[PDB]
Structure 1
Amino acid sequence: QAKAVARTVRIAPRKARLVMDLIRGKQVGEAVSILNLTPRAASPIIEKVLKSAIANAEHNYEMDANNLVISQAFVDEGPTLKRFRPRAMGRASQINKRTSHITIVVSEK
């Protein structure tokens, strides 16, 4: 098994999860092809994380490509930035700019 994690990427959870639901449990080549064809914000980030995991598996532990499957994949929440937006009649509103962690673990089938 090989693991790759990206911490505090400026993307809210519940948006990265939609894409991650597509590629869970599928083969590596199929997962990359799927990620290249969906026009969403989180796809380029998740593709980079997946390729980093692939490179780690090939180099450090001496594993083989064309045989790996996405054993684990999830998105967690992280630190939140708080901002303020003015509104009518001299009031204020709060805005939450959220961040997420992305984890992918590949393994030999």
Structure 2
Amino acid sequence: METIAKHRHARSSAQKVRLVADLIRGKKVSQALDILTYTNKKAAVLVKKVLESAIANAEHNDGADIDDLKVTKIFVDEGPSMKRIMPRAKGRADRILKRTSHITVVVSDR
């Protein structure tokens, strides 16, 4: 089954979250969950929440037996960026980009 689950407009940068995503790609949900539980990154708790939601969606809207689920696909895409002005020396101004991202997790039983 597809049972996708995504979290859009995460405040974390796509690059930073993408390191956490590569850790759990292709692994079973049981091993993915505790891998994220003991990863010391902010992106870890963002991805873990998405993974929890995906498992819940599969259990409720689709077939049960979430024990044999795997994270078939997981990817992070750059989202809209917020432009901010930050003063610098000599009356100079520069643009600060608050980068967001969309985290998409796909789990399946086959």
- The TM-score with structure 1 as length reference comes to 0.96
Question: Which residue is 1:67 aligned to?
Answer: 68
When normalised by structure 2's length, the TM-score is: 0.96
Gaps of 5+ in 1: none
1:38 partner SS: coil
- What is the aligned-residue RMSD (CA, Å)? 0.8
What's the counterpart of residue 104 of structure 2? 103
Aligned pairs (5 A) from 1:1-109: 1=1, 2-109=3-110
Q: Deviations over 1:77-99 (max 9, x none)?
A: 11110011111111111110011
The aligned length equals: 109
Q: Judging by fraction of residues, say which structure has more helix.
A: 2
Gaps of 5+ in 2: none
Give the drift of 1:26.
0.3
Which deviations, in whole Å up to 9, do the C-alpha atoms of 1:46-97 show, x marking residues without a partner? Answer: 1110010001101111231110010110000111100111111111111100
Moved over 3 A (4+): none
